């Protein structure tokens, strides 16, 4: 049986940790909801 | 219960402890999280009851209290920040310029960040603080990592 708690405001932080990449990825999308990588 | 707009973890006790199983926005009086999260379940907030409105297990989205209300969507040039809500960790803004899931019906927005499955809900936002989508729907690549399409809605 779920609940919830807050976690905080939603609001852009000017200088945050600056990470990850961007790739460009052939993905399909099956009926359940699964992501999965074409090739 | 806490209606008050802002992101919220979504925690069950139906295991050992207290378990964050994900994340939600709470905007409108509406609470959005992703499918997979609560398995369209009620949810409590404190001695309030949040009943399911609206959801789709294609989408993975599913909303409470009331119809999707989140509709910013990413500029496709811009950097954005998922405002991650880790297990027992604080919410942190990790800054990020979104990847691209090409698909058969067009292309999706898509952060390379690699966080804990209860991090799932957890917005990604834009430069004036809108919620562009949500974290946690996405695939594990060619390396092990995982990455997250920006799943949105619709607002009718
Ligand atoms: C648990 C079964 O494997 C998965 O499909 C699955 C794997 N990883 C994640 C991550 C990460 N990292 C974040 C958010 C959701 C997932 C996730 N659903």
């Given amino acids: 049986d779920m609940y919830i708690e807050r976690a905080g405001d939603i609001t852009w932080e000017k200088d945050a940790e600056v990470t990850g990449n961007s790739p460009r990825l052939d993905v399909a999308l099956d009926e359940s909801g699964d992501f999965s990588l074409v090739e | 219960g806490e209606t008050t707009d802002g992101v919220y973890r979504v925690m069950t006790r139906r295991l050992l402890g207290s378990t964050q199983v994900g994340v939600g926005v709470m905007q409108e009086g509406v609470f959005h999280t992703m499918w997979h999260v ?78 804990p499955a209860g991090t799932s809900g957890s917005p990604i936002l834009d430069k004036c603080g809108r919620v562009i989508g949500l974290y946690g729907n996405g695939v594990v690549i060619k390396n092990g990592s995982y990455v997250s399409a920006i799943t949105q809605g619709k607002r009718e």
């Fill in chain 2, 38 to 115: 609560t398995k369209g379940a009620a949810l409590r907030s404190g001695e309030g009851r949040l009943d399911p409105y609206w959801g789709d297990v294609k989408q993975d989205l599913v909303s409470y209290c009331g119809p999707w209300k989140l509709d910013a969507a990413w500029d496709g040039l811009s950097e954005v920040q998922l405002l991650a809500v880790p297990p027992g960790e604080r919410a942190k803004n990790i800054q990020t310029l979104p990847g691209i899931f090409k698909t058969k019906d067009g292309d999706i927005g898509a952060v390379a960040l690699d966080y």
